[PDB]
Amino acid sequence: GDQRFGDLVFRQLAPNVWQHTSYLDMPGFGAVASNGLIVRDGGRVLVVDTAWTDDQTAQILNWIKQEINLPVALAVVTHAHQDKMGGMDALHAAGIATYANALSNQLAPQEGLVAAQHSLTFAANGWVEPATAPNFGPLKVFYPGPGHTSDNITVGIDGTDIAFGGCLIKDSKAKSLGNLGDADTEHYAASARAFGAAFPKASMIVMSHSAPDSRAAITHTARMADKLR
Ligand SMILES: [Zn+2]
Ligand SMILES: [Zn+2]
């Protein structure tokens, strides 16, 4: 089901939901896939995460123009790393309103990234404060606690069986938790389990660096994270 578009890949997950995939070569290691989401909600499109680069992100918008041909109302980006926020300038050039965790916006400059235009904040239990996420339609944004990064956030899609763990969640057969350089090793396991508890009905778990999986991605990730503490 993978549709090639230039150097990117697009996969329809549900009637109005597509996964976007972009790649960054790393000498000595390999080309790393990063996944985000595209959601049609009525007469607009919503984006979750940029691609690694501005050019790649502009290609996502080109795909949306060709395949959906509706305005992109907003994007939400799920932490201040290159795979999630590397293409912010491309969104802004296109006139797209952008949203991120307040802390992501705070950290973005020092990470060599451009901040989103708008900051999300979260209730104590981790649900986004709804007034900070206007017009998010079916996107349900949840801060599961610090894990992959301190600022990592997650997104469920109402009307679907899909929840997006971003770089918090790895697939059920993953051999590691990837890049832990900015991780909270104490809180990771609890944060993974909190993601699963936030979206208990989601049967399709989408994530940054693996193809969509069953909820065994959550249990496996949490089990691996237990060993960090
Ligand atoms: Zn990351
Ligand atoms: Zn990542």
Author numbering: 42 to 270
The authors write:
The bacterial metallo-β-lactamases (MBLs) catalyze the inactivation of β-lactam antibiotics. Class B members, known as the metallo-β-lactamases (MBLs), are structurally distinct from the Class A, C, and D enzymes, require one or two zinc ions for catalytic activity, and are not inhibited by currently approved therapeutics. One variant of significance is NDM-4, first identified in 2012 (17).
The first crystals of NDM-4 utilized in this investigation were grown at room temperature using poly(ethylene glycol) 3350 as the precipitant (pH 6.0). They belonged to the space group P21 with a monomer in the asymmetric unit. The model of the enzyme was refined to an overall R-factor of 17.9% at 1.3 Å resolution. The electron density for the polypeptide chain was continuous from Gly 42 to Arg 270. The two zincs that form the binuclear metal center are separated by 3.5 Å. Zn1 is ligated by the side chains of His 120, His 122, His 189 at the so-called “histidine” site and a bridging water (or hydroxide ion) in a distorted tetrahedral arrangement. The bond lengths between Zn1 and the imidazole nitrogens of His 120, His 122, and His 189 are 2.0, 2.1, and 2.0 Å, respectively, whereas the distance between Zn1 and the bridging water is 1.8 Å. Zn2 is surrounded in an octahedral coordination sphere provided by the side chains of Asp 124, Cys 208, His 250 at the so-called “cysteine” site, the bridging solvent and two water molecules. The metal-ligand distances are all ∼2 Å with the exception of that formed between the zinc ion and the thiolate of Cys 208, which is 2.5 Å.
